[PDB]
RNA sequence: CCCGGCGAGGGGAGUGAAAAAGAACCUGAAACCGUGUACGUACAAGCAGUGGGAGCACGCUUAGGCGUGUGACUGCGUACC
């Protein structure tokens, strides 16, 4: 039993009880989210290949936490030209826990 | 009252001795053999 | 405007333009910084390349050897050499215009009045030159650090206050912009008030 | 009003140039003099 | 007003050497070499952040192509058939399905083959 | 007091708040040189890293796996002024 849905820019394959890290979403960290669009749900009789999405599939998940990723460093250099610079970066994310997959 | 005192003492004199040993006039170059790419 | 007394419950009238101005912080800042710079005493020196004890002989010849080129034992890049840009004694005092020096005083006095930090009485003295009497009198009015200004400098008062760290006395003529900001409370006799008012014009 | 509360008027104090200190400052390594030539020498220049 | 340069310079040097742990030989002991090594590593990391997105797509393509010919169809025809059937499945998802679920992949292949018709 | 050449240098005992303050005696960095533990290495070709990535060891943990160290194999890649 697993499903495929299209979150904020990418696609994920997930099952019940999993924890999935996504892009930032503007939702408080206590409540549920709905993913109306689904691409495929499969259990033994896996024939739910919805062409532009499926008909009745929805996914139930609730927001767990917000935070920033791990810092990376950007270095630009040009040999024997008297030029260099540096810059850091950290990325926002959002965790959800899947609670219900319904056909 | 000898050991450490004079033993370390000589290491001061060696510095000045090597310092003077560099008069450098005796450099004796002109690399007497013919010039590398002469006329 | 009307200036309330302290121990006589009367009123004093002074020039509005000398005690009721606004606060021009930029002018005051410039004046106080200039005053601070005038107290310096620039007495320092170093030795240039030409002023180091040594000789003008070349250390070694120009070419031939494997070392770098050198021409003086007192070069600034050698140990025990000279300082590249040595210092001479200087003079750091600045200039302040007469007119823009008085405006700062007027603004400061206006601010002191607005902040209730200025106290006006009519008479202030001690009978004998003893520090304990002055300390007792100051404790009566609940004052700890102040700047006493009097119309004429009494020698008894001046002697009694010399050993007190937080207390200083002055005259109408001898006031400065910094002393007005350093302390919390300022007390002036009425005659001193009139003298200051006519002096600032 | 207090000796550690006054501030200068805005825009009346500019920093000032410091040549030959690193790359980021934009003024290191020939400090704005260009490359070789008479005008890039200690004491170089021509009369009026 | 003389200023000494000991503490600041020592701290700045120690900052770099702590970034060169694990490098071979003098490239983790002396400042003049560790500095250049760290700069090179920065450049390489910046460049590789782009290439990482290409190698994985290459791998996904290869796995999908291998799994599709098990069911008697080429990669290009399979991908084209999916588009004529209006199927939007990411190549990462397709490779994952190919590895971990053969029956679903067979269903997808049969659908695409019918779509080509 | 003990080993030693009635040596040099040590290990105890004792003073002192402290002897890892013992006379080369405040503090005590870096290059440089060692002992011990964990992993890798004797069919393998190059600015020695970076992006992937098994296995092994240690710690936490309730599953589930995390954290630290090492790094087989593989794509790309000819220092600085």
UniProtKB/Swiss-Prot annotation, chain A:
Q: Which species does the entry assign this protein to?
A: Escherichia coli (strain K12)
Q: Single GO molecular-function term? A: rRNA binding
This molecule's function is given as: This protein binds to 23S rRNA in the presence of protein L20.
Report keywords, A-Z: Ribonucleoprotein, Ribosomal protein, RNA-binding, rRNA-binding
The record ties this protein, via InterPro entries, to: bL21-like (IPR028909), bL21-like_sf (IPR036164), Ribosomal_bL21 (IPR001787), Ribosomal_bL21_CS (IPR018258)
Q: Among the record's GO biological process terms, what is one?
A: cytoplasmic translation
* Similarity comment: family membership: Belongs to the bacterial ribosomal protein bL21 family.
Q: DNA-binding: is it a keyword of this entry?
A: no
Q: How does it assemble?
A: Part of the 50S ribosomal subunit. Contacts protein L20.
Sorted alphabetically, the Gene Ontology cellular component annotations on this record are: cytoplasm; cytosol; cytosolic large ribosomal subunit
Source domain of life is: Bacteria
Ranked from the top, the taxonomy reads:
Bacteria, Pseudomonadati, Pseudomonadota, Gammaproteobacteria, Enterobacterales
- Indicate what this protein is called per its UniProt record: Large ribosomal subunit protein bL21
Swiss-Prot record, chain C:
Q: Name one GO biological process term.
A: ribosome assembly
Give me the ranges of the annotated region Disordered. Answer: 44-71
State a single Pfam family of this protein: Ribosomal_L4
**Keyword line:** Antibiotic resistance, Repressor, Ribonucleoprotein, Ribosomal protein, RNA-binding, rRNA-binding, Transcription, Transcription regulation, Transcription termination, Translation regulation
The outcome of changing residue 160 to V is: Does not regulate the S10 operon; assembles into ribosomes in vivo
- Its Gene Ontology molecular function terms? DNA binding; endoribonuclease inhibitor activity; mRNA 5'-UTR binding; RNA-binding transcription regulator activity; rRNA binding; structural constituent of ribosome; translation repressor activity
InterPro entries per record: Ribosomal_uL4, Ribosomal_uL4-like, Ribosomal_uL4_dom_sf
> Is the Transcription regulation keyword given for this protein?
yes
Q: What does this protein do?
A: One of the primary rRNA binding proteins, this protein initially binds near the 5'-end of the 23S rRNA. It is important during the early stages of 50S assembly. It makes multiple contacts with different domains of the 23S rRNA in the assembled 50S subunit and ribosome.
Q: How does it assemble?
A: Part of the 50S ribosomal subunit. In TnaC-stalled ribosomes forms part of the binding pocket for L-Trp with the leader peptide and uL22.
What does the further note read?
The erythromycin sensitive allele is dominant over the resistant allele.
> What family does this chain come from, according to its entry?
Belongs to the universal ribosomal protein uL4 family.
HAMAP family to which the protein is assigned, alphabetical: Ribosomal_uL4_B
**Identification of the protein by name:** Large ribosomal subunit protein uL4
What organism is the protein native to?
Answer: Escherichia coli (strain K12)
From Swiss-Prot, chain D:
Q: Name one GO molecular function term.
A: rRNA binding
Keywords annotated in UniProt: Ribonucleoprotein, Ribosomal protein, RNA-binding, rRNA-binding
Functional note: This protein binds the 5S rRNA. It is required for the late stages of subunit assembly, and is essential for 5S rRNA assembly onto the ribosome.
| GO term, biological process aspect, one | cytoplasmic translation
**Which family is it part of?**
Belongs to the universal ribosomal protein uL15 family.
Protein name per its UniProtKB record: Large ribosomal subunit protein uL15
Protein origin, superkingdom: Bacteria
Q: Where is this region: Disordered?
A: 1-48
rRNA-binding listed as a keyword: yes
Q: Locations of Gly residues compositional bias?
A: 21-31
Q: Give a yes or no for keyword RNA-binding in this entry.
A: yes
What quaternary structure, including any partners, is listed in this protein's UniProt entry? Part of the 50S ribosomal subunit. Contacts the 5S rRNA.
For this record, the Gene Ontology CC terms, alphabetical, are:
cytoplasm; cytosolic large ribosomal subunit
Covered range within the whole protein? 1 to 48 of 144
From Swiss-Prot, chain E:
Alphabetized Pfam families for the sequence: Ribosomal_L20
Instruction: Tell me which InterPro entries the record gives.
Output: Ribosomal_bL20 (IPR005813), RIBOSOMAL_L20_CS (IPR049946), Ribosomal_protein_bL20_C (IPR035566)
Q: Indicate whether Transmembrane appears among the record's keywords.
A: no
| Superkingdom of source | Bacteria
Q: Which PROSITE patterns match?
A: RIBOSOMAL_L20
The Swiss-Prot or TrEMBL record annotates one GO molecular function as: large ribosomal subunit rRNA binding
List keywords of the entry alphabetically: Ribonucleoprotein, Ribosomal protein, RNA-binding, rRNA-binding
As for family, the record states:
Belongs to the bacterial ribosomal protein bL20 family.
**PANTHER family per UniProt:** 39S RIBOSOMAL PROTEIN L20
Biological function = One of the primary rRNA binding proteins, it binds close to the 5'-end of the 23S rRNA. It is important during the early stages of 50S assembly.
Q: HAMAP family, alphabetically?
A: Ribosomal_bL20
Q: What is this protein called?
A: Large ribosomal subunit protein bL20
Species of origin reads: Escherichia coli (strain K12)
């Amino acid at each position: 039993m697993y499903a495929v849905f299209q979150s904020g820019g990418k696609q994920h394959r997930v099952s019940e009880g999993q924890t999935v890290r996504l892009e930032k979403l503007d939702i408080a960290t206590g409540e549920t989210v709905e993913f109306a669009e689904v691409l495929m749900i499969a259990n033994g009789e896996e024939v739910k290949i919805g062409v532009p999405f499926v008909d009745g599939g929805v996914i139930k998940a609730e927001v767990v936490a917000h935070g920033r990723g791990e810092k990376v460093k950007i270095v630009k250099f040009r040999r024997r030209k008297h030029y260099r610079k540096q810059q850091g970066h950290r990325q926002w994310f959002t965790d959800v826990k899947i609670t219900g997959i319904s056909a | 009252m000898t050991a450490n005192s004079r033993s370390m003492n000589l290491s001061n004199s060696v510095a000045v001795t090597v310092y003077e040993a560099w008069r450098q006039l005796g450099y004796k170059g002109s690399w007497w053999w013919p010039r590398i790419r002469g006329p | 405007m009307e200036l309330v007394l302290k121990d006589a419950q009367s009123a004093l009238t002074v020039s509005e333009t000398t005690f009721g101005r606004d606060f021009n912080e930029a002018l005051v800042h410039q004046v106080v910084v200039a005053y601070a710079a005038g107290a310096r005493q620039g007495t320092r020196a170093q030795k240039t390349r030409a002023e180091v004890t040594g000789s003008g002989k070349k250390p070694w010849r120009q070419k031939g050897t494997g070392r770098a080129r050198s021409g003086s034992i007192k070069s600034p890049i050698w140990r025990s050499g000279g300082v590249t840009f040595a210092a001479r004694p200087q003079d750091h005092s600045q200039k302040v215009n007469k007119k823009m020096y008085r405006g700062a005083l007027k603004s400061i006095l206006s601010e002191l009045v607005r902040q209730d930090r200025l106290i006006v009485v009519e008479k202030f003295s001690v009978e004998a030159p003893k520090t304990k009497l002055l300390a007792q009198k100051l404790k009566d009015m609940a004052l700890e650090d102040v700047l006493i200004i009097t119309g004429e400098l009494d020698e008894n008062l001046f002697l009694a206050a010399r050993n007190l760290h937080k207390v200083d006395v002055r005259d109408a003529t001898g006031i400065d912009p910094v002393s007005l900001i350093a302390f919390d409370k300022v007390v002036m006799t009425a005659d001193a008030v009139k003298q200051v008012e006519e002096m600032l014009a | 009003m207090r000796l550690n509360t006054l501030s200068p008027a805005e825009g009346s104090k500019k920093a000032g140039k410091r040549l030959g200190r690193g790359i980021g400052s934009g003024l290191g390594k020939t400090g704005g003099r260009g490359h070789k030539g008479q005008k890039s020498r200690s004491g170089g220049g021509v009369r009026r | 007003a003389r200023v000494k340069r000991g503490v600041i310079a020592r701290a700045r040097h120690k900052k770099i050497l702590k970034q060169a742990k694990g490098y071979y030989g003098a490239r983790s002991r002396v400042y003049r070499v560790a500095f250049q090594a760290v700069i090179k590593a920065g450049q390489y990391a910046y460049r590789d952040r782009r290439q990482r997105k290409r190698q994985f797509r290459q791998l996904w393509i290869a796995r999908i192509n291998a799994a599709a010919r098990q069911n008697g169809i080429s990669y290009s025809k399979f991908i084209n058939g999916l588009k004529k059937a209006s199927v939007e499945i990411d190549r990462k998802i397709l490779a994952d399905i190919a590895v971990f679920d053969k029956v679903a992949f067979t269903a997808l292949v049969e659908k695409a083959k019918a779509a080509l018709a």
